[PDB]
Ligand binder design. Structure first.
Ligand SMILES: O=C(O)C(=O)C[C@H](O)[C@H](O)CO
Ligand SMILES: O=C(O)C(=O)C[C@H](O)[C@H](O)CO
Ligand SMILES: [Mg+2]
Ligand SMILES: [Mg+2]
Lengths: 385, 385
């Protein structure tokens, strides 16, 4: 058995998505997500111009070997572009193996550990009043967990520039959660995304102020290239901590996990090298009772969601799954076997990861440049968005 | 003052090279290296399709702000592709600032700390006899330091597959250095590149066996994604340790440095985000008396070498500079103001980093795909090349 082609497909059914399709001389084929929001074409080149030519002729059944080949063979290891390419290959290969086995992917990973996959939605508002309303809406839709984000009073052809001020946020954010618990009580899981805006001391300060509100987690409270950054936070607060959507290898989280500085690892199948590698991250996390909390914004295509759900269905130390709804056009371009119902996602029995791509339809939505925004402090200082 | 264009130029005068040219409305321009061996086009896309459009209209004098903008603004941080792009921008901007100041780059960094730049050459042989002869050649040429690599008995358009066996190497490499010292004595600096082939224990074993031969350094002895990997080596041998050519940010070396696990940091201007970032790496290293030993293979264009030499001329804790001669064609495409003389490199007084690119000549050498080799053990296990 041999790989006869590894093609990259680009489409924009509401937003940009890059997909890798691996074809074999035995009819069966697999697809993987390679989307890197804001830098999509760099991954297209990485795959199309370098990796794909190497895959031709290889035995697609050798998932581990190919993973090691692309990971070690690159010589320059790790990285967002590098790991997105590896992830696309890995997803496509697991898709092929599950199809060949005649089973939905989760069966190959070890079988079902749960029925439904708990998710959380995004309740946003320009102020506390509006955000409180948004959370109520998600509660009415049957969500068990809701992430609440509010604008702070006083604070995509090219990157939009957003402003930020820590003191203003510190004086406002706690009030949001105080009102939420006062309004809806403590039955629902409430989440907050710090989005890399605080220093460790400020994150500890915020976490402490949020303690009486029992949050499910405070996410990405401070930049984590330095894994010691969560030390001060963990030492001063019991508010659960989550991090990792931008991580791409287990090396980005090894210390955060072993030093027990986090409660949830947010790494994803597309961000951290496919099922092959994400499984290793989850296993390490399980040793310290850290649970998975896979990132799941819309810039992760339905192919990733399919793989993520198969993973979530099997993984023992499952925590929660982020869920942002894709547009109808995206759902049409990426036929998938998973659905949402009363606060939970469910993956189907379709062999493979259950997702596919309609190449003919995909071609009707041409690529369109789009950037993530950037953030600057009031004095103009480049900050973390 | 504004950036009017940020163009990517590709040329293959003996091997592939990618250059970024930043033009301004004032007229002055700067160039930077963006070459990523074996994955060159991914950086081309990263710069051409994403970063470049953002630079237009920016004030090229704001080197630090632009570095932070591209680094933080990408959202997905670090990585070989990411940092190569950032380095190309940084090199071009420093080139511009030095031209505007009317001074060679080293003057802007803090002035001259030394006259010549000590380098090491590459003595290679199929066996010990041949390698010993090769080292004698570099000694003849006036090299104060020589890297010695030998083939081990019993051990392009697509990646070549090389073989490897640790036990065979462990039984042979020590003999190479024993013969070198017996033949040439201890006056010259002798280096060895383990090239990621050993586990920490084996590296510690090799390190101890090489101790009687007083090496300048044992390089990349074991894969370092896990910075704790050098612990065992450092605990068991006094042989100097070097690592870092594949690193792209200070985060890849922070622990190796602070835990005093290495003696030389090999990060480069092109690999680790330009002068702006490499400077921070060098400063951290100096606190622990770790010295710079910049990587300098041919896949680093003359633009990188120029910037590297300006850096080497100033940096207080300079250790050594690797030097692999480029082809005559490459030197013609990249006119530079630096030269070699009796084991030392010297940077010139030309304002900027002293290097430029002849676009008309560059266009005569079209890109040609070339991959780095991969390594497999005797049983077929994918290994580190
Ligand atoms: O939903 C979240 O948790 C996010 O932070 C969304 C991210 O900004 C987005 O996926 C970046 O592409
Ligand atoms: O010369 C050295 O130290 C090297 O290891 C060379 C590398 O293999 C080469 O630059 C990779 O592109
Ligand atoms: Mg987030
Ligand atoms: Mg080396």
């Amino acid at each position: 058995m041999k790989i006869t082609a590894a093609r990259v497909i680009i489409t924009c059914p509401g937003r940009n998505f890059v997909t890798l399709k691996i074809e074999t001389d035995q009819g069966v084929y697999g697809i993987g997500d390679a989307t890197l929001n804001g830098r999509e074409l760099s991954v297209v080149a990485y795959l199309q111009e370098h990796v794909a030519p190497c895959l031709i002729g290889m035995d697609p059944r050798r998932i581990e070997d190919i993973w090691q080949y692309v990971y070690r063979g690159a010589y320059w290891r790790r990285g967002p572009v590098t790991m997105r390419a590896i992830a696309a290959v890995d997803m496509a290969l697991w898709d092929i193996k599950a199809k060949m086995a005649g089973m939905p992917l989760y069966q190959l990973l070890g079988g079902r550990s749960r029925d439904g996959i708990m998710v959380y939605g995004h309740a946003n508002g320009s102020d506390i009043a509006e955000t409180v309303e948004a959370v109520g809406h998600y509660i009415d839709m049957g969500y068990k967990a809701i992430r609440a984000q509010t604008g702070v009073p006083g604070i995509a052809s090219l990157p939009s520039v957003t402003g930020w001020d820590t003191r203003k946020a510190l004086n406002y954010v706690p009030k949001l959660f105080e009102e939420l618990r006062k309004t809806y009580g403590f039955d629902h899981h409430l989440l907050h995304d710090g989005h890399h805006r605080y220093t460790p001391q400020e994150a500890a300060n915020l976490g402490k102020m949020l303690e009486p509100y029992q949050l499910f987690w405070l996410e990405d409270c401070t930049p984590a290239e330095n894994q010691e950054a969560f030390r001060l936070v963990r030492q001063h607060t019991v508010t659960p901590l989550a991090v990792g959507e931008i991580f791409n290898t287990i090396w980005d989280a090894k210390d955060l996990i072993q030093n027990q500085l986090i409660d949830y690892i947010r790494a994803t199948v597309v961000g951290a090298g496919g099922l092959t590698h994400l499984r290793r991250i989850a296993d390490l996390a399980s040793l310290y009772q850290v649970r998975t909390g896979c990132h799941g914004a819309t810039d992760l295509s339905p192919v990733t969601m399919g793989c993520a759900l198969h993973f979530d269905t099997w993984v023992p130390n499952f925590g929660i799954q982020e869920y942002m709804r894709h547009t109808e056009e995206t759902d049409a371009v990426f036929p998938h076997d998973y659905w949402f119902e009363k606060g939970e996602l469910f993956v189907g029995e379709t062999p493979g990861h259950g997702v596919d791509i309609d190449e003919e339809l995909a071609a009707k939505y041409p690529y369109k440049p789009a950037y993530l925004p950037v953030a600057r402090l009031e004095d103009g200082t480049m900050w973390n968005w």
